[PDB]
Design a protein around this ligand. Structure first.
Ligand SMILES: CS(=O)(=O)Nn1c(=O)[nH]c2cc([N+](=O)[O-])c(-n3ccnc3)cc2c1=O
Ligand SMILES: N[C@@H](CCC(=O)O)C(=O)O
Lengths: 259, 257
């Protein structure tokens, strides 16, 4: 078997630089949930591999003018990498150009509050205005609310689009900082995975509340025609059924946690 | 006309009240009935809903190595596609193809209200309250194959338990919980557990969190000309907000409690 080129992304706690990474080389430089995942996938599929960080540090979107895919997805479609093992969301536009395994992690839109905020659900948020709430100013979460035919979510959308000042943010970091500087009066809506992770880091002043508002997954991606597709897919399923993915999630979110 | 295999399971596929006087696809109603319509429309095919012959989900017989249920119907050419609460699993994915999940779920515990049990660990450490699973489905296989201590102990008890803790249909497991005065707890998927919790006589409840994390997919036989279109159609329907609305319509909107 040829050395498999794995593309991945520096996003905590999926892939991070080890403590002494400057004293290390190759795959030993990195650690995290997706580093452990890549080792398990390689073992089950009988390949050796090289972890490479995606050049542009992006996930994969198609430029609407140039029609060029950036990110890990571009690296797959242009033949620059053999497989992407990262927190890459399974979406229609990507599935049209690459193959995804079944999900290795389930996630969805969720509520981030400052600790002690009287909110426990989307329902709770939808029936008041004292606590302002919002999303990234563009992307899937904003559009989820815009599209939603569910009453509580349409109610939330109607509030959010009218709200002044803007309840929207340019970046995830802006949204998190806005929850923290807000004294309980702002809730941020983001993916549960990131929400649960931030819950477990210092300052330790935020928490996740309520069910997930929708249902998405991260998948392992291969270019179309990859001889790895079937085996990768089965390996993800095997690892899930053995409880290994749950184990890794617990490890990287909680065992490594700081709160 | 595509032959669609499915299973009678509330609220996915249900006989309409006036079914004896109805014909074809109009006999049935539910989440998976609505989903079959959307998928067929998106993929541009005609279809007939046919309830699985043996009323099972699909397991490989340990003696004969023959598949039963919906998986059997796909693998032996009795049906072209399965649109049902069919759990995506390793052993099935080896013999048929699944779309991406149209719904997420995990194994959960159903109790008669007031049963002094709140976790799987609670259950494993006592004999007074009997507990079991559906036969021929993924939950039984989850416990059978499990190497996790708590669930291992649970399977050991379950495989030996007298009389049998296993049931043939979900409605049987639920009727058993309701008839047994707290002496029987049922292990079922969170989706169905939550539905029943919101149905009269409102005498059951879900306890603890899910035991695992998984999804239902639409299944096709290997080499099906339908595989790619169906897979993409599920993602499109999810991103449209349509799968969430359908779940709302059949769970929350029809809630009796
Ligand atoms: C929106 S998309 O089409 O699904 N692309 N996409 C992914 O696939 N995975 C992601 C994972 C993360 N993340 O932190 O794990 C973030 N992230 C980064 C900072 N906050 C969140 C963004 C994305 C992201 O944008
Ligand atoms: N959805 C399961 C059946 C229900 C259960 O096992 O609890 C399957 O496809 O096998």
């Amino acid at each position: 078997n040829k050395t498999v080129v794995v593309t991945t992304i520096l996003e905590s706690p999926y892939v991070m630089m080890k403590k002494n990474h400057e004293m290390l080389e190759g795959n030993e430089r990195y650690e995290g949930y997706c580093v452990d995942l890549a080792a398990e996938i390689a073992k089950h599929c009988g390949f050796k591999y090289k972890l490479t960080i995606v050049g542009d540090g992006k996930y994969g979107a198609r430029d609407a003018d140039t029609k060029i895919w950036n990110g890990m997805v571009g690296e797959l479609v242009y033949g620059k990498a053999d497989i992407a093992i990262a927190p890459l969301t399974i979406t229609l536009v990507r599935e049209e150009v690459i193959d995804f395994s079944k999900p290795f992690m389930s996630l969805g839109i969720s509520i981030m509050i400052k600790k002690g905020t009287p909110i426990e659900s989307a329902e709770d948020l939808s029936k008041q205005t004292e606590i302002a709430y919002g999303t990234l100013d563009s992307g899937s979460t904003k559009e989820f609310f815009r599209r939603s035919k569910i009453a509580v979510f349409d109610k939330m959308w109607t509030y959010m689009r009218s709200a002044e000042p803007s309840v929207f943010v340019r970046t995830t970091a802006e949204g998190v900082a806005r929850v923290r500087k807000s004294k309980g009066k702002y809730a941020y809506l983001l993916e549960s995975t990131m929400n649960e992770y931030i819950e477990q880091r210092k300052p330790c002043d935020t928490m996740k509340v309520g069910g997930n508002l929708d249902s998405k997954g991260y998948g392992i991606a291969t270019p179309k025609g990859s001889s790895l597709r079937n085996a990768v897919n089965l390996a993800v399923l095997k690892l899930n059924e053995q409880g290994l993915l749950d184990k890794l999630k617990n490890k990287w979110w909680y065992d490594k946690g700081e709160c």
